[PDB]
Amino acid sequence: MKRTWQPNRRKRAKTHGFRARMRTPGGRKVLKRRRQKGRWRLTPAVRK
Amino acid sequence: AVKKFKPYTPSRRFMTVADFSEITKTEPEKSLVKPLKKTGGRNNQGRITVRFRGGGHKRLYRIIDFKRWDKVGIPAKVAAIEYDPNRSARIALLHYVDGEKRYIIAPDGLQVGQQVVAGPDAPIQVGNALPLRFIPVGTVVHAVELEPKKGAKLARAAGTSAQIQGREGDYVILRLPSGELRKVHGECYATVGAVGNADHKNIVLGKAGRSRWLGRRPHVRGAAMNPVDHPHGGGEGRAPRGRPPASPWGWQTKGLKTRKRRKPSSRFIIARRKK
RNA sequence: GAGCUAGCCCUGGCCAGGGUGAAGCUGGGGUGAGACCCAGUGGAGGCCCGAACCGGUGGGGGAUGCAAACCCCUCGGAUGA
RNA sequence: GAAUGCCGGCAUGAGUAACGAUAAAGAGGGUGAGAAUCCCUCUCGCCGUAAGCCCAAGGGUUCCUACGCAAUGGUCGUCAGCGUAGGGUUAGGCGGGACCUAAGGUGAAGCCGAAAGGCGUAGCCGAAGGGCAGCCGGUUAAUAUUCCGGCCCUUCCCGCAGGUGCGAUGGGGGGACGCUCUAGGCUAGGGGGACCGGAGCCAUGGACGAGCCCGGCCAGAAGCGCAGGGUGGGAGGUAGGCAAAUCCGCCUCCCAACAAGCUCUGCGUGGUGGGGAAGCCCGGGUGACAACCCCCCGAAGCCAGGGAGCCAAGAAAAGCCUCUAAGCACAACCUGCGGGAACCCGUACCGCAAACCGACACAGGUGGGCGGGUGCAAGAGCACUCAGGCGCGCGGGAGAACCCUCGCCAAGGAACUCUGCAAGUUGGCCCCGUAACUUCGGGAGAAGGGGUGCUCCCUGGGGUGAUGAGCCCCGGGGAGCCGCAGUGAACAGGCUCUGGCGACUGUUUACCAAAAACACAGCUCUCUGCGAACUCGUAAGAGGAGGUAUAGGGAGCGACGCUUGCCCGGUGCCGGAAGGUCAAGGGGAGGGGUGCAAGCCCCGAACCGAAGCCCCGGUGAACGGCGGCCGUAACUAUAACGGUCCUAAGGUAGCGAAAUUCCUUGUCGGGUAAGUUCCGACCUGCACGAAAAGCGUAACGACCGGAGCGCUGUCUCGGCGAGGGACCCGGUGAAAUUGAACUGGCCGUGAAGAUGCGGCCUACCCGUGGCAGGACGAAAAGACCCCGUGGAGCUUUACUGCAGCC
RNA sequence: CGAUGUCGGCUCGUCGCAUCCUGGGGCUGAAGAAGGUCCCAAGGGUUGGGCUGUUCGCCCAUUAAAGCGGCACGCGAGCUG
RNA sequence: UGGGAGAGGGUGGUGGAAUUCCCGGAGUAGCGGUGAAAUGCGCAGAUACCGGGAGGAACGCCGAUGGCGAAGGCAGCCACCUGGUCCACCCGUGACGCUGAGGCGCGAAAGCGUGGGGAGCAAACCGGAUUAGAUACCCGGGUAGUCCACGCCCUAAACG
RNA sequence: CCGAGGGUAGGGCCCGUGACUGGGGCGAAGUCGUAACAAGGUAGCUGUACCGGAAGGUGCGGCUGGAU
RNA sequence: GCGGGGUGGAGCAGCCUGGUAGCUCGUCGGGCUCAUAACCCGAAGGUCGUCGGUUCAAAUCCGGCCCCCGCAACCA
Ligand SMILES: CO/C(CO[C@H]1O[C@H](C)[C@@H](OC)[C@H](OC)[C@@H]1O)=C1\O[C@H](Oc2ccc(/C=C(\C)C(=O)N[C@H]3[C@@H](O)[C@H](n4cnc5c(N(C)C)ncnc54)O[C@@H]3CO)cc2)[C@@H](O)[C@@H]1O
Ligand SMILES: *C(=O)[C@H](CCSC)NC=O
Ligand SMILES: [K+]
Ligand SMILES: [Mg+2]
Ligand SMILES: [Mg+2]
Ligand SMILES: [Mg+2]
Ligand SMILES: [Mg+2]
Ligand SMILES: [Mg+2]
Ligand SMILES: [Mg+2]
Ligand SMILES: [Mg+2]
Ligand SMILES: [Mg+2]
Ligand SMILES: [Mg+2]
Ligand SMILES: [Mg+2]
Ligand SMILES: [Mg+2]
Ligand SMILES: [Mg+2]
Ligand SMILES: [Mg+2]
Ligand SMILES: [Mg+2]
Ligand SMILES: [Mg+2]
Ligand SMILES: [Mg+2]
Ligand SMILES: [Mg+2]
Ligand SMILES: [Mg+2]
Ligand SMILES: [Mg+2]
Ligand SMILES: [Mg+2]
Ligand SMILES: [Mg+2]
Ligand SMILES: [Mg+2]
Ligand SMILES: [Mg+2]
Ligand SMILES: [Mg+2]
Ligand SMILES: [Mg+2]
Ligand SMILES: [Mg+2]
Ligand SMILES: [Mg+2]
Ligand SMILES: [Mg+2]
Ligand SMILES: [Mg+2]
Ligand SMILES: [Mg+2]
Ligand SMILES: [Mg+2]
Ligand SMILES: [Mg+2]
Ligand SMILES: [Mg+2]
Ligand SMILES: [Mg+2]
Ligand SMILES: [Mg+2]
Ligand SMILES: [Mg+2]
Ligand SMILES: [Mg+2]
Ligand SMILES: [Mg+2]
Ligand SMILES: [Mg+2]
Ligand SMILES: [Mg+2]
Ligand SMILES: [Mg+2]
Ligand SMILES: [Mg+2]
Ligand SMILES: [Mg+2]
Ligand SMILES: [Mg+2]
Ligand SMILES: [Mg+2]
Ligand SMILES: [Mg+2]
Ligand SMILES: [Mg+2]
Ligand SMILES: [Mg+2]
Ligand SMILES: [Mg+2]
Ligand SMILES: [Mg+2]
Ligand SMILES: [Mg+2]
Ligand SMILES: [Mg+2]
Ligand SMILES: [Mg+2]
Ligand SMILES: [Mg+2]
Ligand SMILES: [Mg+2]
Ligand SMILES: [Mg+2]
Ligand SMILES: [Mg+2]
Ligand SMILES: [Mg+2]
Ligand SMILES: [Mg+2]
Ligand SMILES: [Mg+2]
Ligand SMILES: [Mg+2]
Ligand SMILES: [Mg+2]
Ligand SMILES: [Mg+2]
Ligand SMILES: [Mg+2]
Ligand SMILES: [Mg+2]
Ligand SMILES: [Mg+2]
Ligand SMILES: [Mg+2]
Ligand SMILES: [Mg+2]
Ligand SMILES: [Mg+2]
Ligand SMILES: [Mg+2]
Ligand SMILES: [Mg+2]
Ligand SMILES: [Mg+2]
Ligand SMILES: [Mg+2]
Ligand SMILES: [Mg+2]
Ligand SMILES: [Mg+2]
Ligand SMILES: [Mg+2]
Ligand SMILES: [Mg+2]
Ligand SMILES: [Mg+2]
Ligand SMILES: [Mg+2]
Ligand SMILES: [Mg+2]
Ligand SMILES: [Mg+2]
Ligand SMILES: [Mg+2]
Ligand SMILES: [Mg+2]
Ligand SMILES: [Mg+2]
Ligand SMILES: [Mg+2]
Ligand SMILES: [Mg+2]
Ligand SMILES: [Mg+2]
Ligand SMILES: [Mg+2]
Ligand SMILES: [Mg+2]
Ligand SMILES: [Mg+2]
Ligand SMILES: [Mg+2]
Ligand SMILES: [Mg+2]
Ligand SMILES: [Mg+2]
Ligand SMILES: [Mg+2]
Ligand SMILES: [Mg+2]
Ligand SMILES: [Mg+2]
Ligand SMILES: [Mg+2]
Ligand SMILES: [Mg+2]
Ligand SMILES: [Mg+2]
Ligand SMILES: [Mg+2]
Ligand SMILES: [Mg+2]
Ligand SMILES: [Mg+2]
Ligand SMILES: [Mg+2]
Ligand SMILES: [Mg+2]
Ligand SMILES: [Mg+2]
Ligand SMILES: [Mg+2]
Ligand SMILES: [Mg+2]
Ligand SMILES: [Mg+2]
Ligand SMILES: [Mg+2]
Ligand SMILES: [Mg+2]
Ligand SMILES: [Mg+2]
Ligand SMILES: [Mg+2]
Ligand SMILES: [Mg+2]
Ligand SMILES: [Mg+2]
Ligand SMILES: [Mg+2]
Ligand SMILES: [Mg+2]
Ligand SMILES: [Mg+2]
Ligand SMILES: [Mg+2]
Ligand SMILES: [Mg+2]
Ligand SMILES: [Mg+2]
Ligand SMILES: [Mg+2]
Ligand SMILES: [Mg+2]
Ligand SMILES: [Mg+2]
Ligand SMILES: [Mg+2]
Ligand SMILES: [Mg+2]
Ligand SMILES: [Mg+2]
Ligand SMILES: [Mg+2]
Ligand SMILES: [Mg+2]
Ligand SMILES: [Mg+2]
Ligand SMILES: [Mg+2]
Ligand SMILES: [Mg+2]
Ligand SMILES: [Mg+2]
Ligand SMILES: [Mg+2]
Ligand SMILES: [Mg+2]
Ligand SMILES: [Mg+2]
Ligand SMILES: [Mg+2]
Ligand SMILES: [Mg+2]
Ligand SMILES: [Mg+2]
Ligand SMILES: [Mg+2]
Ligand SMILES: [Mg+2]
Ligand SMILES: [Mg+2]
Ligand SMILES: [Mg+2]
Ligand SMILES: [Mg+2]
Ligand SMILES: [Mg+2]
Ligand SMILES: [Mg+2]
Ligand SMILES: [Mg+2]
Ligand SMILES: [Mg+2]
Ligand SMILES: [Mg+2]
Ligand SMILES: [Mg+2]
Ligand SMILES: [Mg+2]
Ligand SMILES: [Mg+2]
Ligand SMILES: [Mg+2]
Ligand SMILES: [Mg+2]
Ligand SMILES: [Mg+2]
Ligand SMILES: [Mg+2]
Ligand SMILES: [Mg+2]
Ligand SMILES: [Mg+2]
Ligand SMILES: [Mg+2]
Ligand SMILES: [Mg+2]
Ligand SMILES: [Mg+2]
Ligand SMILES: [Mg+2]
Ligand SMILES: [Mg+2]
Ligand SMILES: [Mg+2]
Ligand SMILES: [Mg+2]
Ligand SMILES: [Mg+2]
Ligand SMILES: [Mg+2]
Ligand SMILES: [Mg+2]
Ligand SMILES: [Mg+2]
Ligand SMILES: [Mg+2]
Ligand SMILES: [Mg+2]
Ligand SMILES: [Mg+2]
Ligand SMILES: [Mg+2]
Ligand SMILES: [Mg+2]
Ligand SMILES: [Mg+2]
Ligand SMILES: [Mg+2]
Ligand SMILES: [Mg+2]
Ligand SMILES: [Mg+2]
Ligand SMILES: [Mg+2]
Ligand SMILES: [Mg+2]
Ligand SMILES: [Mg+2]
Ligand SMILES: [Mg+2]
Ligand SMILES: [Mg+2]
Ligand SMILES: [Mg+2]
Ligand SMILES: [Mg+2]
Ligand SMILES: [Mg+2]
Ligand SMILES: [Mg+2]
Ligand SMILES: [Mg+2]
Ligand SMILES: [Mg+2]
Ligand SMILES: [Mg+2]
Ligand SMILES: [Mg+2]
Ligand SMILES: [Mg+2]
Ligand SMILES: [Mg+2]
Ligand SMILES: [Mg+2]
Ligand SMILES: [Mg+2]
Ligand SMILES: [Mg+2]
Ligand SMILES: [Mg+2]
Ligand SMILES: [Mg+2]
Ligand SMILES: [Mg+2]
Ligand SMILES: [Mg+2]
Ligand SMILES: [Mg+2]
Ligand SMILES: [Mg+2]
Ligand SMILES: [Mg+2]
Ligand SMILES: [Mg+2]
Ligand SMILES: [Mg+2]
Ligand SMILES: [Mg+2]
Ligand SMILES: [Mg+2]
Ligand SMILES: [Mg+2]
Ligand SMILES: [Mg+2]
Ligand SMILES: [Mg+2]
Ligand SMILES: [Mg+2]
Ligand SMILES: [Mg+2]
């Protein structure tokens, strides 16, 4: 049947993207945390 | 003079449509239309604040002149009468001798190719607009300003009208469409005649789908819900109201007056409404 | 977190073929004038049959599955909420 | 040593299930250490509105070539979407950006919020919408509207010529719009040709033929032709389009008004450039100087911004054209010609799937376009088949039970069973015919029946063309032929009677309920005078609504028909400037503390004092409620009648053993041989009843009852047959479960149901196909039940708070 | 209660005997026939339908007869629901 | 041809008296109602009186034993539109007449549908009296309806 | 070919009959009330509407076949 | 199981709070009327379901018994 993950590069970037995260207090603390933990990528990969 | 249909479908058996006989022009005046932004009953928060709205036919807003004291003494000819999907009334196209074109809601009995005019010294004829103070007591009137220069607020729906009952200082007494007896300032403009399309209320929608065309989504009864949803929710099987009949938000809906008591306009409302 | 799902908004797209034959219009008849009757034309409809498409009624199968809801037969809607 | 402990390792089940659609294979020849599985050939089968082809998402080198086979591939592997390496994606015209706006997002000005932040006009961003200039063919192992060939076109810069009041983010026009139906003329595509071109073929009884087989085009500037779209011309006045305006709007006058003219697209033709089959040789060559023509069918695509009808009344902005303002009129813009200039990103490949979403090379899911031919009335249905693509990554045997999917069955024909569940029957088209009832539409495909192929003769009308031949499309009549059978295959209703519920088409518990539930038009009550009520928000601000009582909110009821009784004592809502109570506050009789005292400080009666409550009324389609006992008629029985008590008032019409009736399978009637169900009645209604509506109602229903006809493997009652499994052999090889086990029966005993204790009996050791009585078999720390001063949802005249409102 | 699935049907039986029939008896208010009652006897047999979920029961048509019980109210790793 | 009386019909308009409700003023202990009462109303200020406003229905005197119409029926006043009818003159047509099964139209009240309207009155209904009872007659309330528009119904002691 | 008639299916008319149900007629001495005839103790009758154990009552309009 | 009830002939007060039985109707007697009903004037009638008990004293308060109404009978 139709499953839940239905990829969309524009959707991904506008939802979870760097610029999305920076526009918000909670979003910015996500980046802060992920940097502090030392994540190799702070934001989902998407091909633009 | 509403139109009927033969019972060749179940729904078509009860349906009635307007006779559209007054309409003489079937596309709007392009410089006088702008897009009507459909809300679906959602506010700027994106929240439903008026339940059961949406999905109706696309519409173009016809810009309506609810002022008229704009062009005092400048006569106009009634160029056409058209359909307006945003209101019950019909609208009349006015070609001012000024070269200006403008919409008003069409009063009853108004004919294309007649002259209309606005101002203190305008004749008492259907289609004209005057300050209330200059209109003869006893005259039926529509598109009435409530306060001066603020715009026509009163009696704009199809077939509605207000009647001048008397005068008192700078104010005149109106009998509103509701039956309320109210004081309205004498400087308030108002158009003589009743709003047209009085047979509007005799229309029988005929089927569920016709509600949907009008942007009216299905209304679900509180009794059909659960207690999380509504005061009348739940109950094993059908249930009587079992408490004073209420709205989704808890307040009583059978008689409970809701007009704010300390409202300043109380000093101007003489008698509360009719039936 | 509304890339599943529910609603609404904006902009596009889709619905083989066949059947029924509303109003209207024209002519004919009728009448003081009418209503109305007949025929032709006309092509209405949450109209009818039926693919695509949207479903999921009954039964069978599957049940460490092909599948954490599927498969077969059958069945509902298919110009419309 | 135990925690259904944690991590890891390794066992058991077991050579067991399985190896992922039953579209299907066989052989010959290659290659190689090794071949059912790789390559080639022939034969066979499968898809062909797809299982072919193109595009968009998503994916991200998977593309092509060489070299490999440890792992990946459900087997094998020499092969591969796998490993290594090298190569491959080329644009002014295709798509997106250097253009435009949509929702929405953002957001100078402005507003609001303890902070973080929330709003918000203009503007800006935002696309599969608008706008915008490239078509045919060739070429590579792999790219091509990109490279190349031919033939075209756009913008920008500059220059030349000619023209003009040039000039804009400003004004105006335009862009610019729905749904259904649809005309004319074309194109796409297709059928045929006795015509044109072609390697060849004559078989096996016949055919050297007006034979068979193959093909018979594509693109193309200007001009021309056919078909369409768009668009009146001139003058005078002007106060409106937020400056101006010769523009646009308005008024008047004249001319032209189904036209023409001008303009703009489609199609045709068109210099020219391309393509070009079978077959036969080895993707290439030839065929070939290939031919490239005529007739028919014909779109849903084109002309297009076409037409008509209808109500539910159908984006914006730019490009473009026109107007003027500053300014400038040595300019500048317009037109033609010429040269120069023309950037960034994508382009491989998969793309209904083995490369996307489903952990898998997963019978699932995934938007758009093209989708040939014949026949069946049509069609994208169905059967076959073209181009093209496949035989689904374990096989070989066997021919048991049993399972699935399928075929047939004597006699009977629902006797099966909760139930005709299931499966039969029926089945398309044409014609005949068709009942109650009805809201006059319907019910209707009612029911029921007849016809259906092929041949010969005669004949009517239409499209095209020419008015004719040919082609193609609808028909009518006669005479015949064959079969068991003519919609000969495939696709394609079983029907009738009668209740209950719901009017109706719709909607729902994604994944156990599709219904009588929700919705629904319609009906009523009620709130709301507009800065509306109401809703979201602390707020600003929004929705309501750019609406205005024929409108908007809330509630119940639920098409329609005939109707909807009585009770206002209690709760609610509505009204009531009296009275009663009432908080802070006002008041200050009278006290108190302290000081030597002026004073400072504390308490404080009457009385004035709001909403609320009390109090007086109203109100039922507001919450709701609508009696008991006893007696009475000239047979009896029963009580129209009466007596009395109680209530706020004592249930009306209609209906009634009901989706409601306990006793109950009430009683009686109908149907049956027989009827706890069903239908019709009766009425002592345990416990109907009037908008939580009452009683009906044509039509409707994958709803739930009951009956009948038709037909059947449902059954009596089973039999045979087919394929996929099951079985045997080669290959690969799980699982839950498992204290260990050397694990019988009976009668007892035992914590009360013993392989395991007693006594007896029976029993050689080990497997394979099978069946399920037991191992209180497995799975899941029982959902029921209780317990816990355990939890959560829900309710209220439980308690206590808070929003909100007064 | 870290699960002993449950009415009825179906299928498959097997056992008990307080015996429904068939076999053998005594007594009879047993003339014969046909009954009643009691004894012995478990070898075999013990029908098909209408109603209802039913077990049971009522009914229809037959029969030699249309028996009653146990087996986790036998039997869902056998099916139904 | 000329002339006449009339509530004949239809449409639009409009005038006064009265009832009721509402606002204001003044004023106080009752009003109302009947056979007699009670219910009801009233110190929360009623009844009675004055000013103002809204609204609906009906038209006093003229009015008659009258007029008009086919009947049902028609009554303030005004305008428009329109039917029937009588008289006079003796001008025109030249039997063109009478009746009329069917058909068609009209048709009081009540009643029905859809909107409106609603003062007074008032089925139903409630209450107070009477009575053995009183589902009545009398009293206080009171919903349809009475009124308008359009569409139905088509009855009558539609009688002379 | 026609054809008596047989068969299948579906309509129309008529008769008989049916649990039960509706009123009707009749029946020496039943129960309740007293509507009409006198102004019948509310003049009656009336068409229609609603209501009531029952006659009836009431509304709206009509008739005199109404007493005064 | 829980609650309520039994009193002149009928239907109801009295019980709670011990001493006292009452209201309407009916029945009997007289009146009015030609007569009956209505109406009017008088009057009779219970000894409180039954058996115990508390008490000076019981319809009354407590207990047992018999009836009579209403409510309840739920989870599997
Ligand atoms: C019942 O639950 C279970 C088993 O559950 C397991 O299996 C289930 C199938 C699973 O369900 C998904 C479950 O998963 C959780 C679990 O694995 C268990 O409880 C078992 O213990 C039992 C307890 C009670 C019962 C029977 C009960 C509660 C009962 O009420 N029986 C009634 C009813 O069946 C039957 N009955 C009375 N009325 C009528 C009647 N009427 C009213 C007309 N008409 C007809 N049948 C009537 O009568 C019986 C006795 O009176 C049976 C077993 C235990 O051994 C077993 O593990
Ligand atoms: C009672 O029978 C119960 C039924 C479950 S109801 C959720 N099961 C008992 O074992
Ligand atoms: K339970
Ligand atoms: Mg996932
Ligand atoms: Mg998606
Ligand atoms: Mg994207
Ligand atoms: Mg997106
Ligand atoms: Mg972002
Ligand atoms: Mg890194
Ligand atoms: Mg990581
Ligand atoms: Mg209609
Ligand atoms: Mg109109
Ligand atoms: Mg615009
Ligand atoms: Mg916003
Ligand atoms: Mg937001
Ligand atoms: Mg709302
Ligand atoms: Mg909404
Ligand atoms: Mg309109
Ligand atoms: Mg005002
Ligand atoms: Mg209308
Ligand atoms: Mg609409
Ligand atoms: Mg609803
Ligand atoms: Mg609701
Ligand atoms: Mg509910
Ligand atoms: Mg619910
Ligand atoms: Mg919620
Ligand atoms: Mg709640
Ligand atoms: Mg409730
Ligand atoms: Mg409920
Ligand atoms: Mg209930
Ligand atoms: Mg419910
Ligand atoms: Mg209720
Ligand atoms: Mg309740
Ligand atoms: Mg509120
Ligand atoms: Mg008001
Ligand atoms: Mg979020
Ligand atoms: Mg979504
Ligand atoms: Mg999405
Ligand atoms: Mg399609
Ligand atoms: Mg036709
Ligand atoms: Mg037409
Ligand atoms: Mg349809
Ligand atoms: Mg299914
Ligand atoms: Mg089936
Ligand atoms: Mg499953
Ligand atoms: Mg399937
Ligand atoms: Mg299927
Ligand atoms: Mg199928
Ligand atoms: Mg269909
Ligand atoms: Mg739609
Ligand atoms: Mg230990
Ligand atoms: Mg474990
Ligand atoms: Mg543990
Ligand atoms: Mg572990
Ligand atoms: Mg192992
Ligand atoms: Mg092993
Ligand atoms: Mg095994
Ligand atoms: Mg496979
Ligand atoms: Mg498998
Ligand atoms: Mg191999
Ligand atoms: Mg090999
Ligand atoms: Mg193979
Ligand atoms: Mg090969
Ligand atoms: Mg095909
Ligand atoms: Mg991937
Ligand atoms: Mg390998
Ligand atoms: Mg290998
Ligand atoms: Mg290697
Ligand atoms: Mg592998
Ligand atoms: Mg695999
Ligand atoms: Mg090799
Ligand atoms: Mg190029
Ligand atoms: Mg640039
Ligand atoms: Mg922009
Ligand atoms: Mg774009
Ligand atoms: Mg558009
Ligand atoms: Mg482009
Ligand atoms: Mg120029
Ligand atoms: Mg210019
Ligand atoms: Mg410009
Ligand atoms: Mg527009
Ligand atoms: Mg339409
Ligand atoms: Mg055409
Ligand atoms: Mg072409
Ligand atoms: Mg063809
Ligand atoms: Mg021969
Ligand atoms: Mg100007
Ligand atoms: Mg070639
Ligand atoms: Mg050559
Ligand atoms: Mg058009
Ligand atoms: Mg200047
Ligand atoms: Mg650049
Ligand atoms: Mg490419
Ligand atoms: Mg592809
Ligand atoms: Mg698929
Ligand atoms: Mg596709
Ligand atoms: Mg693939
Ligand atoms: Mg995936
Ligand atoms: Mg595979
Ligand atoms: Mg797949
Ligand atoms: Mg067909
Ligand atoms: Mg295969
Ligand atoms: Mg396949
Ligand atoms: Mg057979
Ligand atoms: Mg038969
Ligand atoms: Mg049966
Ligand atoms: Mg059945
Ligand atoms: Mg079936
Ligand atoms: Mg069949
Ligand atoms: Mg068929
Ligand atoms: Mg009919
Ligand atoms: Mg029909
Ligand atoms: Mg048929
Ligand atoms: Mg043949
Ligand atoms: Mg087939
Ligand atoms: Mg069919
Ligand atoms: Mg029933
Ligand atoms: Mg339903
Ligand atoms: Mg339904
Ligand atoms: Mg119903
Ligand atoms: Mg309905
Ligand atoms: Mg409905
Ligand atoms: Mg479900
Ligand atoms: Mg569920
Ligand atoms: Mg789910
Ligand atoms: Mg299901
Ligand atoms: Mg359904
Ligand atoms: Mg309704
Ligand atoms: Mg809020
Ligand atoms: Mg707005
Ligand atoms: Mg509303
Ligand atoms: Mg209510
Ligand atoms: Mg509903
Ligand atoms: Mg309902
Ligand atoms: Mg009817
Ligand atoms: Mg009440
Ligand atoms: Mg009250
Ligand atoms: Mg009350
Ligand atoms: Mg006072
Ligand atoms: Mg104080
Ligand atoms: Mg109550
Ligand atoms: Mg009362
Ligand atoms: Mg009643
Ligand atoms: Mg009634
Ligand atoms: Mg009954
Ligand atoms: Mg029954
Ligand atoms: Mg019963
Ligand atoms: Mg029962
Ligand atoms: Mg029975
Ligand atoms: Mg019978
Ligand atoms: Mg049943
Ligand atoms: Mg029945
Ligand atoms: Mg009875
Ligand atoms: Mg209710
Ligand atoms: Mg009903
Ligand atoms: Mg029906
Ligand atoms: Mg259904
Ligand atoms: Mg079988
Ligand atoms: Mg086989
Ligand atoms: Mg092996
Ligand atoms: Mg051992
Ligand atoms: Mg052993
Ligand atoms: Mg024991
Ligand atoms: Mg034992
Ligand atoms: Mg021992
Ligand atoms: Mg032992
Ligand atoms: Mg032993
Ligand atoms: Mg033994
Ligand atoms: Mg073996
Ligand atoms: Mg085995
Ligand atoms: Mg076993
Ligand atoms: Mg076992
Ligand atoms: Mg489990
Ligand atoms: Mg646990
Ligand atoms: Mg537990
Ligand atoms: Mg559990
Ligand atoms: Mg506690
Ligand atoms: Mg405790
Ligand atoms: Mg707790
Ligand atoms: Mg809690
Ligand atoms: Mg247990
Ligand atoms: Mg377990
Ligand atoms: Mg004898
Ligand atoms: Mg035996
Ligand atoms: Mg036996
Ligand atoms: Mg039985
Ligand atoms: Mg029984
Ligand atoms: Mg037992
Ligand atoms: Mg089972
Ligand atoms: Mg069972
Ligand atoms: Mg088991
Ligand atoms: Mg077991
Ligand atoms: Mg069940
Ligand atoms: Mg003469
Ligand atoms: Mg003469
Ligand atoms: Mg006559
Ligand atoms: Mg009439
Ligand atoms: Mg009234
Ligand atoms: Mg008279
Ligand atoms: Mg015969
Ligand atoms: Mg008698
Ligand atoms: Mg009388
Ligand atoms: Mg009398
Ligand atoms: Mg009388
Ligand atoms: Mg009575
Ligand atoms: Mg009465
Ligand atoms: Mg005498
Ligand atoms: Mg005594
Ligand atoms: Mg005593
Ligand atoms: Mg004593
Ligand atoms: Mg005593
Ligand atoms: Mg006593
Ligand atoms: Mg006492
Ligand atoms: Mg419970």
Closest CA to B134 of B196, B68, B191, B195: B191
Residues lining ion ligand 24 (Cβ < 5 A) are B 224
Q: How many CB atoms lie within 10 A of CB A17?
A: 17
3-state class of B42 per DSSP?
Answer: strand
Q: How far is the CA of B246 from the C1' of D772 (A)?
A: 64
Beta strand B140-142 pairing with B189-192: antiparallel
What technique was this entry resolved by?
X-ray
Which residues hold their Cβ within 5 A of ligand 154, which is an ion? B 240
Give CA–CA dist B122/B126, Å, rounded.
11
Cα B134 to Cα B123: distance, rounded to the nearest angstrom: 10
Q: Are B81 and B44 in contact (CB under 8 A)?
A: no
Task: Provide the resolution (angstroms).
Answer: 2.7
Measured in angstroms, what separates residue B208's CA from nucleotide D438's C1'?
A: 25
Residue B228, SS3 per DSSP: coil
- Pairwise CA distance, residues B24 & B83, whole Å: 9
B176 CA to D635 C1' in angstroms comes to: 79
**DSSP letter string, B144-186:** EESSTTT-EEES-STT--EEEEEEETTEEEEE-TTS-EEEEET
Chain B window 233-262: residues with CB closer than 7 Å to nucleic chain D are: 233-234, 237-249, 251-262
Residues less than 5 Å from ion ligand 18, measured at CB: B 83-84
Q: Which ligand is nearest to the CA of A20?
A: 8
D chain positions with any atom within 7 Å of a protein CB: 57-60, 103-106, 116-117, 119-120, 172-174, 176-177, 238-241, 248-251, 310-316, 356-358, 364-366, 439-441, 503-505, 511, 517-522, 525-537, 541-544, 546-560, 571-575, 618, 622-624, 692-693, 698-699, 793-797, 805-806
Distance B6 CA to ligand 83 centre (A): 33
Which one-letter DSSP state was computed for residue B24? -
